[PDB]
Amino acid sequence: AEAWYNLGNAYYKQGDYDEAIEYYQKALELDPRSAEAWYNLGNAYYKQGDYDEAIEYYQKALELDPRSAEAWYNLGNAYYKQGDYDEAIEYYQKALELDPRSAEAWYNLGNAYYKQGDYDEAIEYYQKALELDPRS
Ligand SMILES: [Cl-]
Ligand SMILES: [Cl-]
Ligand SMILES: [Cl-]
Ligand SMILES: [Cl-]
Ligand SMILES: [Cl-]
Ligand SMILES: [Cl-]
Ligand SMILES: [Cl-]
Ligand SMILES: [Cl-]
Ligand SMILES: [Cl-]
Ligand SMILES: [Cl-]
Ligand SMILES: [Cl-]
Ligand SMILES: [Cl-]
Ligand SMILES: [Cl-]
Ligand SMILES: [Pb+2]
Ligand SMILES: [Pb+2]
Ligand SMILES: [Pb+2]
Ligand SMILES: [Pb+2]
Ligand SMILES: [Pb+2]
Ligand SMILES: [Pb+2]
Ligand SMILES: [Pb+2]
């Protein structure tokens, strides 16, 4: 499974998401245990703009490792891309409980509240983001 997974990773890293999906799926047929495998399969679908597929496999990754701030965050992103800002906020919240150091994660939490027209909540999370990284 690991060699198939590494092939998928190499394709993913050069931006060939169709090939990444093929070889990630092969790795999971042999070893469905890896959270990082389901997570990166989700990432591959996300990068294609196949957000329902991304959501399906992010959930699988989270069921195997619910401590994964990265998986919660990317699940948030998939909903944000669908315009589901309520679900985006819910999953960003869980990501930021597990790792509150990511200026990027606070920023996108702010963006999700901004998109709902909740400007004071946007301000709160933008302020946190800029406290960590004041360059953007
Ligand atoms: Cl391609
Ligand atoms: Cl193709
Ligand atoms: Cl192909
Ligand atoms: Cl083909
Ligand atoms: Cl789709
Ligand atoms: Cl589909
Ligand atoms: Cl399906
Ligand atoms: Cl939607
Ligand atoms: Cl949208
Ligand atoms: Cl929905
Ligand atoms: Cl709200
Ligand atoms: Cl509000
Ligand atoms: Cl409100
Ligand atoms: Pb191709
Ligand atoms: Pb789809
Ligand atoms: Pb599917
Ligand atoms: Pb929806
Ligand atoms: Pb709401
Ligand atoms: Pb408010
Ligand atoms: Pb509101």
Side-chain angles (χ1 to χ4, degrees):
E2 194 185 69
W4 283 116
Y5 173 74
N6 283 165
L7 181 58
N9 272 150
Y11 276 113
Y12 181 84
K13 299 278 191 197
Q14 70 174 211
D16 287 321
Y17 304 121
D18 49 311
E19 282 81 13
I21 288 161
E22 284 183 68
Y23 301 124
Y24 283 154
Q25 278 179 196
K26 208 90 77 190
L28 288 167
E29 281 173 3
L30 300 175
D31 201 348
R33 93 190 317 94
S34 180
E36 206 171 356
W38 289 108
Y39 166 74
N40 280 310
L41 177 59
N43 291 340
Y45 274 111
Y46 179 94
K47 290 286 190 72
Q48 289 189 327
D50 194 339
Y51 299 123
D52 60 295
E53 290 292 298
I55 286 161
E56 182 186 356
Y57 299 123
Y58 286 146
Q59 283 178 328
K60 218 105 175 205
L62 279 170
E63 145 188 323
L64 305 180
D65 182 23
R67 310 306 315 284
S68 175
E70 285 71 19
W72 284 115
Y73 175 65
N74 284 5
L75 180 61
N77 293 334
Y79 278 108
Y80 186 100
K81 285 297 204 191
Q82 291 187 155
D84 285 314
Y85 302 117
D86 274 317
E87 289 91 337
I89 289 162
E90 176 181 325
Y91 298 130
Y92 287 157
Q93 277 179 344
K94 300 200 159 146
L96 282 168
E97 267 139 43
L98 301 177
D99 190 346
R101 290 170 297 177
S102 180
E104 187 163 22
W106 289 113
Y107 185 64
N108 292 335
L109 215 207
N111 288 330
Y113 273 109
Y114 188 94
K115 285 290 204 188
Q116 284 210 313
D118 292 329
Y119 302 118
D120 52 295
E121 288 80 10
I123 286 156
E124 182 178 344
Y125 300 125
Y126 286 160
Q127 290 279 18
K128 257 141 198 187
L130 286 162
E131 186 195 343
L132 293 164
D133 188 356
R135 293 181 287 107
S136 177

PDB file of all heavy atoms in Angstrom, residues 17-43:
ATOM      1  N   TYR A  17      -3.871  15.443 -10.357  1.00  0.00           N
ATOM      2  CA  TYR A  17      -4.819  15.018  -9.296  1.00  0.00           C
ATOM      3  C   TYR A  17      -5.567  13.754  -9.734  1.00  0.00           C
ATOM      4  O   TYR A  17      -5.845  12.914  -8.854  1.00  0.00           O
ATOM      5  CB  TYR A  17      -5.731  16.189  -8.923  1.00  0.00           C
ATOM      6  CG  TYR A  17      -4.962  17.410  -8.488  1.00  0.00           C
ATOM      7  CD1 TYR A  17      -5.094  18.620  -9.149  1.00  0.00           C
ATOM      8  CD2 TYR A  17      -4.063  17.340  -7.436  1.00  0.00           C
ATOM      9  CE1 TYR A  17      -4.368  19.736  -8.762  1.00  0.00           C
ATOM     10  CE2 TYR A  17      -3.329  18.446  -7.037  1.00  0.00           C
ATOM     11  CZ  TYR A  17      -3.485  19.648  -7.701  1.00  0.00           C
ATOM     12  OH  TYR A  17      -2.766  20.737  -7.308  1.00  0.00           O
ATOM     13  N   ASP A  18      -5.863  13.610 -11.030  1.00  0.00           N
ATOM     14  CA  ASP A  18      -6.517  12.393 -11.587  1.00  0.00           C
ATOM     15  C   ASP A  18      -5.634  11.174 -11.284  1.00  0.00           C
ATOM     16  O   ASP A  18      -6.168  10.185 -10.746  1.00  0.00           O
ATOM     17  CB  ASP A  18      -6.851  12.533 -13.077  1.00  0.00           C
ATOM     18  CG  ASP A  18      -5.715  13.044 -13.946  1.00  0.00           C
ATOM     19  OD1 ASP A  18      -5.104  14.072 -13.573  1.00  0.00           O
ATOM     20  OD2 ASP A  18      -5.445  12.411 -14.988  1.00  0.00           O
ATOM     21  N   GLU A  19      -4.330  11.247 -11.571  1.00  0.00           N
ATOM     22  CA  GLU A  19      -3.386  10.126 -11.310  1.00  0.00           C
ATOM     23  C   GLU A  19      -3.272   9.898  -9.798  1.00  0.00           C
ATOM     24  O   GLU A  19      -3.295   8.729  -9.384  1.00  0.00           O
ATOM     25  CB  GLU A  19      -2.011  10.378 -11.928  1.00  0.00           C
ATOM     26  CG  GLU A  19      -1.966  10.125 -13.426  1.00  0.00           C
ATOM     27  CD  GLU A  19      -2.483  11.259 -14.291  1.00  0.00           C
ATOM     28  OE1 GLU A  19      -2.671  12.373 -13.761  1.00  0.00           O
ATOM     29  OE2 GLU A  19      -2.698  11.029 -15.504  1.00  0.00           O
ATOM     30  N   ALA A  20      -3.155  10.969  -9.006  1.00  0.00           N
ATOM     31  CA  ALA A  20      -3.090  10.897  -7.525  1.00  0.00           C
ATOM     32  C   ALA A  20      -4.274  10.072  -6.998  1.00  0.00           C
ATOM     33  O   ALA A  20      -4.040   9.146  -6.192  1.00  0.00           O
ATOM     34  CB  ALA A  20      -3.067  12.286  -6.931  1.00  0.00           C
ATOM     35  N   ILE A  21      -5.491  10.388  -7.452  1.00  0.00           N
ATOM     36  CA  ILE A  21      -6.757   9.698  -7.057  1.00  0.00           C
ATOM     37  C   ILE A  21      -6.645   8.203  -7.387  1.00  0.00           C
ATOM     38  O   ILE A  21      -6.960   7.386  -6.504  1.00  0.00           O
ATOM     39  CB  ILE A  21      -7.978  10.352  -7.734  1.00  0.00           C
ATOM     40  CG1 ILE A  21      -8.284  11.723  -7.123  1.00  0.00           C
ATOM     41  CG2 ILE A  21      -9.192   9.433  -7.681  1.00  0.00           C
ATOM     42  CD1 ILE A  21      -9.146  12.603  -7.991  1.00  0.00           C
ATOM     43  N   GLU A  22      -6.217   7.865  -8.607  1.00  0.00           N
ATOM     44  CA  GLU A  22      -6.080   6.461  -9.084  1.00  0.00           C
ATOM     45  C   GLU A  22      -5.219   5.655  -8.106  1.00  0.00           C
ATOM     46  O   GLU A  22      -5.674   4.584  -7.668  1.00  0.00           O
ATOM     47  CB  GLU A  22      -5.442   6.410 -10.471  1.00  0.00           C
ATOM     48  CG  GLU A  22      -6.378   6.804 -11.593  1.00  0.00           C
ATOM     49  CD  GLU A  22      -5.735   6.661 -12.961  1.00  0.00           C
ATOM     50  OE1 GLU A  22      -5.473   5.511 -13.369  1.00  0.00           O
ATOM     51  OE2 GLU A  22      -5.474   7.699 -13.598  1.00  0.00           O
ATOM     52  N   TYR A  23      -4.022   6.150  -7.780  1.00  0.00           N
ATOM     53  CA  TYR A  23      -2.983   5.398  -7.029  1.00  0.00           C
ATOM     54  C   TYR A  23      -3.249   5.482  -5.519  1.00  0.00           C
ATOM     55  O   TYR A  23      -2.906   4.516  -4.808  1.00  0.00           O
ATOM     56  CB  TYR A  23      -1.595   5.862  -7.477  1.00  0.00           C
ATOM     57  CG  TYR A  23      -1.372   5.647  -8.952  1.00  0.00           C
ATOM     58  CD1 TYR A  23      -1.018   6.687  -9.796  1.00  0.00           C
ATOM     59  CD2 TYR A  23      -1.565   4.396  -9.517  1.00  0.00           C
ATOM     60  CE1 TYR A  23      -0.839   6.485 -11.156  1.00  0.00           C
ATOM     61  CE2 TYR A  23      -1.388   4.176 -10.872  1.00  0.00           C
ATOM     62  CZ  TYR A  23      -1.020   5.224 -11.696  1.00  0.00           C
ATOM     63  OH  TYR A  23      -0.846   5.004 -13.031  1.00  0.00           O
ATOM     64  N   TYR A  24      -3.863   6.569  -5.040  1.00  0.00           N
ATOM     65  CA  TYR A  24      -4.376   6.664  -3.646  1.00  0.00           C
ATOM     66  C   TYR A  24      -5.459   5.599  -3.438  1.00  0.00           C
ATOM     67  O   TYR A  24      -5.434   4.920  -2.395  1.00  0.00           O
ATOM     68  CB  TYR A  24      -4.934   8.055  -3.328  1.00  0.00           C
ATOM     69  CG  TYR A  24      -3.925   9.144  -3.050  1.00  0.00           C
ATOM     70  CD1 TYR A  24      -4.254  10.469  -3.287  1.00  0.00           C
ATOM     71  CD2 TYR A  24      -2.674   8.879  -2.513  1.00  0.00           C
ATOM     72  CE1 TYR A  24      -3.364  11.496  -3.025  1.00  0.00           C
ATOM     73  CE2 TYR A  24      -1.770   9.895  -2.247  1.00  0.00           C
ATOM     74  CZ  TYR A  24      -2.116  11.212  -2.504  1.00  0.00           C
ATOM     75  OH  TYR A  24      -1.244  12.228  -2.245  1.00  0.00           O
ATOM     76  N   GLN A  25      -6.375   5.456  -4.403  1.00  0.00           N
ATOM     77  CA  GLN A  25      -7.483   4.463  -4.360  1.00  0.00           C
ATOM     78  C   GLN A  25      -6.895   3.045  -4.323  1.00  0.00           C
ATOM     79  O   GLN A  25      -7.438   2.207  -3.576  1.00  0.00           O
ATOM     80  CB  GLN A  25      -8.447   4.654  -5.534  1.00  0.00           C
ATOM     81  CG  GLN A  25      -9.473   5.756  -5.302  1.00  0.00           C
ATOM     82  CD  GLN A  25     -10.418   5.958  -6.462  1.00  0.00           C
ATOM     83  OE1 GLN A  25     -11.100   6.975  -6.559  1.00  0.00           O
ATOM     84  NE2 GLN A  25     -10.472   4.987  -7.357  1.00  0.00           N
ATOM     85  N   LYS A  26      -5.816   2.798  -5.074  1.00  0.00           N
ATOM     86  CA  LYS A  26      -5.113   1.485  -5.122  1.00  0.00           C
ATOM     87  C   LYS A  26      -4.501   1.182  -3.749  1.00  0.00           C
ATOM     88  O   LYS A  26      -4.645   0.040  -3.284  1.00  0.00           O
ATOM     89  CB  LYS A  26      -4.035   1.475  -6.212  1.00  0.00           C
ATOM     90  CG  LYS A  26      -3.728   0.103  -6.799  1.00  0.00           C
ATOM     91  CD  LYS A  26      -4.577  -0.246  -8.007  1.00  0.00           C
ATOM     92  CE  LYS A  26      -4.122   0.453  -9.272  1.00  0.00           C
ATOM     93  NZ  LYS A  26      -5.095   0.284 -10.378  1.00  0.00           N
ATOM     94  N   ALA A  27      -3.847   2.170  -3.129  1.00  0.00           N
ATOM     95  CA  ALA A  27      -3.213   2.065  -1.791  1.00  0.00           C
ATOM     96  C   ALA A  27      -4.266   1.695  -0.738  1.00  0.00           C
ATOM     97  O   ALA A  27      -3.964   0.863   0.136  1.00  0.00           O
ATOM     98  CB  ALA A  27      -2.520   3.359  -1.441  1.00  0.00           C
ATOM     99  N   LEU A  28      -5.459   2.290  -0.831  1.00  0.00           N
ATOM    100  CA  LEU A  28      -6.556   2.131   0.161  1.00  0.00           C
ATOM    101  C   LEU A  28      -7.257   0.778  -0.023  1.00  0.00           C
ATOM    102  O   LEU A  28      -7.752   0.240   0.988  1.00  0.00           O
ATOM    103  CB  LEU A  28      -7.533   3.303   0.015  1.00  0.00           C
ATOM    104  CG  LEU A  28      -7.008   4.643   0.531  1.00  0.00           C
ATOM    105  CD1 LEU A  28      -7.888   5.789   0.062  1.00  0.00           C
ATOM    106  CD2 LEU A  28      -6.894   4.637   2.047  1.00  0.00           C
ATOM    107  N   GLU A  29      -7.296   0.250  -1.251  1.00  0.00           N
ATOM    108  CA  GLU A  29      -7.819  -1.112  -1.555  1.00  0.00           C
ATOM    109  C   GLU A  29      -6.957  -2.163  -0.843  1.00  0.00           C
ATOM    110  O   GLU A  29      -7.507  -3.220  -0.475  1.00  0.00           O
ATOM    111  CB  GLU A  29      -7.852  -1.367  -3.064  1.00  0.00           C
ATOM    112  CG  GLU A  29      -9.041  -0.727  -3.760  1.00  0.00           C
ATOM    113  CD  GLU A  29      -9.021  -0.813  -5.278  1.00  0.00           C
ATOM    114  OE1 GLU A  29      -8.090  -1.440  -5.826  1.00  0.00           O
ATOM    115  OE2 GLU A  29      -9.940  -0.252  -5.909  1.00  0.00           O
ATOM    116  N   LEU A  30      -5.663  -1.880  -0.656  1.00  0.00           N
ATOM    117  CA  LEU A  30      -4.686  -2.787   0.006  1.00  0.00           C
ATOM    118  C   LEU A  30      -4.616  -2.488   1.510  1.00  0.00           C
ATOM    119  O   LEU A  30      -4.455  -3.449   2.286  1.00  0.00           O
ATOM    120  CB  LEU A  30      -3.313  -2.613  -0.654  1.00  0.00           C
ATOM    121  CG  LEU A  30      -3.255  -2.916  -2.152  1.00  0.00           C
ATOM    122  CD1 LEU A  30      -1.878  -2.597  -2.711  1.00  0.00           C
ATOM    123  CD2 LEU A  30      -3.623  -4.363  -2.439  1.00  0.00           C
ATOM    124  N   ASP A  31      -4.723  -1.213   1.904  1.00  0.00           N
ATOM    125  CA  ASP A  31      -4.597  -0.770   3.320  1.00  0.00           C
ATOM    126  C   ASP A  31      -5.566   0.381   3.586  1.00  0.00           C
ATOM    127  O   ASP A  31      -5.200   1.548   3.454  1.00  0.00           O
ATOM    128  CB  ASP A  31      -3.146  -0.401   3.643  1.00  0.00           C
ATOM    129  CG  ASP A  31      -2.821  -0.415   5.126  1.00  0.00           C
ATOM    130  OD1 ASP A  31      -3.768  -0.497   5.933  1.00  0.00           O
ATOM    131  OD2 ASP A  31      -1.619  -0.356   5.462  1.00  0.00           O
ATOM    132  N   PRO A  32      -6.829   0.090   3.980  1.00  0.00           N
ATOM    133  CA  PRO A  32      -7.801   1.130   4.324  1.00  0.00           C
ATOM    134  C   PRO A  32      -7.656   1.705   5.746  1.00  0.00           C
ATOM    135  O   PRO A  32      -8.601   2.311   6.213  1.00  0.00           O
ATOM    136  CB  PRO A  32      -9.169   0.425   4.209  1.00  0.00           C
ATOM    137  CG  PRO A  32      -8.874  -1.000   3.756  1.00  0.00           C
ATOM    138  CD  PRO A  32      -7.414  -1.254   4.067  1.00  0.00           C
ATOM    139  N   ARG A  33      -6.497   1.528   6.391  1.00  0.00           N
ATOM    140  CA  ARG A  33      -6.280   1.870   7.825  1.00  0.00           C
ATOM    141  C   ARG A  33      -5.755   3.307   7.965  1.00  0.00           C
ATOM    142  O   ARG A  33      -6.020   3.923   9.014  1.00  0.00           O
ATOM    143  CB  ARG A  33      -5.326   0.859   8.474  1.00  0.00           C
ATOM    144  CG  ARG A  33      -3.855   1.257   8.460  1.00  0.00           C
ATOM    145  CD  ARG A  33      -2.917   0.140   8.893  1.00  0.00           C
ATOM    146  NE  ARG A  33      -3.399  -0.592  10.061  1.00  0.00           N
ATOM    147  CZ  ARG A  33      -4.123  -1.714  10.032  1.00  0.00           C
ATOM    148  NH1 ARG A  33      -4.474  -2.272   8.884  1.00  0.00           N
ATOM    149  NH2 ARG A  33      -4.497  -2.277  11.168  1.00  0.00           N
ATOM    150  N   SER A  34      -5.032   3.812   6.960  1.00  0.00           N
ATOM    151  CA  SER A  34      -4.266   5.086   7.020  1.00  0.00           C
ATOM    152  C   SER A  34      -5.209   6.291   6.923  1.00  0.00           C
ATOM    153  O   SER A  34      -5.896   6.420   5.892  1.00  0.00           O
ATOM    154  CB  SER A  34      -3.218   5.136   5.942  1.00  0.00           C
ATOM    155  OG  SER A  34      -2.482   6.350   6.007  1.00  0.00           O
ATOM    156  N   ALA A  35      -5.211   7.146   7.953  1.00  0.00           N
ATOM    157  CA  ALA A  35      -5.947   8.431   7.998  1.00  0.00           C
ATOM    158  C   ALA A  35      -5.349   9.397   6.968  1.00  0.00           C
ATOM    159  O   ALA A  35      -6.130  10.076   6.270  1.00  0.00           O
ATOM    160  CB  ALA A  35      -5.895   9.012   9.390  1.00  0.00           C
ATOM    161  N   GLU A  36      -4.015   9.437   6.874  1.00  0.00           N
ATOM    162  CA  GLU A  36      -3.251  10.332   5.961  1.00  0.00           C
ATOM    163  C   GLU A  36      -3.572   9.980   4.499  1.00  0.00           C
ATOM    164  O   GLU A  36      -3.514  10.894   3.652  1.00  0.00           O
ATOM    165  CB  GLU A  36      -1.749  10.235   6.250  1.00  0.00           C
ATOM    166  CG  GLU A  36      -0.975  11.487   5.870  1.00  0.00           C
ATOM    167  CD  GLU A  36       0.472  11.525   6.337  1.00  0.00           C
ATOM    168  OE1 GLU A  36       0.895  10.592   7.049  1.00  0.00           O
ATOM    169  OE2 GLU A  36       1.176  12.493   5.987  1.00  0.00           O
ATOM    170  N   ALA A  37      -3.904   8.713   4.220  1.00  0.00           N
ATOM    171  CA  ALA A  37      -4.261   8.200   2.875  1.00  0.00           C
ATOM    172  C   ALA A  37      -5.637   8.731   2.454  1.00  0.00           C
ATOM    173  O   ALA A  37      -5.736   9.287   1.342  1.00  0.00           O
ATOM    174  CB  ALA A  37      -4.226   6.692   2.864  1.00  0.00           C
ATOM    175  N   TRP A  38      -6.656   8.554   3.302  1.00  0.00           N
ATOM    176  CA  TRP A  38      -8.038   9.070   3.087  1.00  0.00           C
ATOM    177  C   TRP A  38      -8.007  10.599   2.974  1.00  0.00           C
ATOM    178  O   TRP A  38      -8.743  11.142   2.129  1.00  0.00           O
ATOM    179  CB  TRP A  38      -8.978   8.617   4.214  1.00  0.00           C
ATOM    180  CG  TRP A  38      -9.306   7.155   4.199  1.00  0.00           C
ATOM    181  CD1 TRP A  38      -8.853   6.205   5.068  1.00  0.00           C
ATOM    182  CD2 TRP A  38     -10.164   6.468   3.268  1.00  0.00           C
ATOM    183  NE1 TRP A  38      -9.366   4.979   4.743  1.00  0.00           N
ATOM    184  CE2 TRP A  38     -10.173   5.107   3.644  1.00  0.00           C
ATOM    185  CE3 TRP A  38     -10.920   6.864   2.160  1.00  0.00           C
ATOM    186  CZ2 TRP A  38     -10.909   4.147   2.950  1.00  0.00           C
ATOM    187  CZ3 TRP A  38     -11.648   5.915   1.475  1.00  0.00           C
ATOM    188  CH2 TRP A  38     -11.640   4.575   1.866  1.00  0.00           C
ATOM    189  N   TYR A  39      -7.193  11.255   3.807  1.00  0.00           N
ATOM    190  CA  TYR A  39      -7.011  12.730   3.869  1.00  0.00           C
ATOM    191  C   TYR A  39      -6.466  13.235   2.525  1.00  0.00           C
ATOM    192  O   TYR A  39      -7.068  14.158   1.938  1.00  0.00           O
ATOM    193  CB  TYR A  39      -6.114  13.088   5.060  1.00  0.00           C
ATOM    194  CG  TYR A  39      -5.576  14.497   5.079  1.00  0.00           C
ATOM    195  CD1 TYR A  39      -6.389  15.576   5.386  1.00  0.00           C
ATOM    196  CD2 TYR A  39      -4.239  14.750   4.815  1.00  0.00           C
ATOM    197  CE1 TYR A  39      -5.895  16.871   5.411  1.00  0.00           C
ATOM    198  CE2 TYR A  39      -3.727  16.038   4.839  1.00  0.00           C
ATOM    199  CZ  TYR A  39      -4.558  17.103   5.138  1.00  0.00           C
ATOM    200  OH  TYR A  39      -4.059  18.373   5.164  1.00  0.00           O
ATOM    201  N   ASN A  40      -5.383  12.627   2.031  1.00  0.00           N
ATOM    202  CA  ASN A  40      -4.710  13.060   0.776  1.00  0.00           C
ATOM    203  C   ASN A  40      -5.577  12.693  -0.436  1.00  0.00           C
ATOM    204  O   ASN A  40      -5.515  13.438  -1.431  1.00  0.00           O
ATOM    205  CB  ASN A  40      -3.275  12.535   0.687  1.00  0.00           C
ATOM    206  CG  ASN A  40      -2.317  13.364   1.516  1.00  0.00           C
ATOM    207  OD1 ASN A  40      -2.298  14.589   1.409  1.00  0.00           O
ATOM    208  ND2 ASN A  40      -1.530  12.711   2.356  1.00  0.00           N
ATOM    209  N   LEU A  41      -6.378  11.625  -0.360  1.00  0.00           N
ATOM    210  CA  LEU A  41      -7.380  11.297  -1.413  1.00  0.00           C
ATOM    211  C   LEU A  41      -8.426  12.416  -1.456  1.00  0.00           C
ATOM    212  O   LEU A  41      -8.817  12.821  -2.568  1.00  0.00           O
ATOM    213  CB  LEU A  41      -8.035   9.940  -1.140  1.00  0.00           C
ATOM    214  CG  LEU A  41      -9.130   9.541  -2.133  1.00  0.00           C
ATOM    215  CD1 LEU A  41      -8.591   9.484  -3.557  1.00  0.00           C
ATOM    216  CD2 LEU A  41      -9.753   8.209  -1.753  1.00  0.00           C
ATOM    217  N   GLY A  42      -8.854  12.895  -0.283  1.00  0.00           N
ATOM    218  CA  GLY A  42      -9.762  14.049  -0.151  1.00  0.00           C
ATOM    219  C   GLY A  42      -9.162  15.294  -0.781  1.00  0.00           C
ATOM    220  O   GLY A  42      -9.880  15.975  -1.539  1.00  0.00           O
ATOM    221  N   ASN A  43      -7.887  15.569  -0.483  1.00  0.00           N
ATOM    222  CA  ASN A  43      -7.116  16.728  -1.010  1.00  0.00           C
ATOM    223  C   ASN A  43      -7.100  16.680  -2.541  1.00  0.00           C
ATOM    224  O   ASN A  43      -7.324  17.734  -3.166  1.00  0.00           O
ATOM    225  CB  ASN A  43      -5.694  16.765  -0.441  1.00  0.00           C
ATOM    226  CG  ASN A  43      -5.653  17.086   1.038  1.00  0.00           C
ATOM    227  OD1 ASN A  43      -6.606  17.638   1.584  1.00  0.00           O
ATOM    228  ND2 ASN A  43      -4.554  16.754   1.694  1.00  0.00           N
TER     229      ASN A  43
END
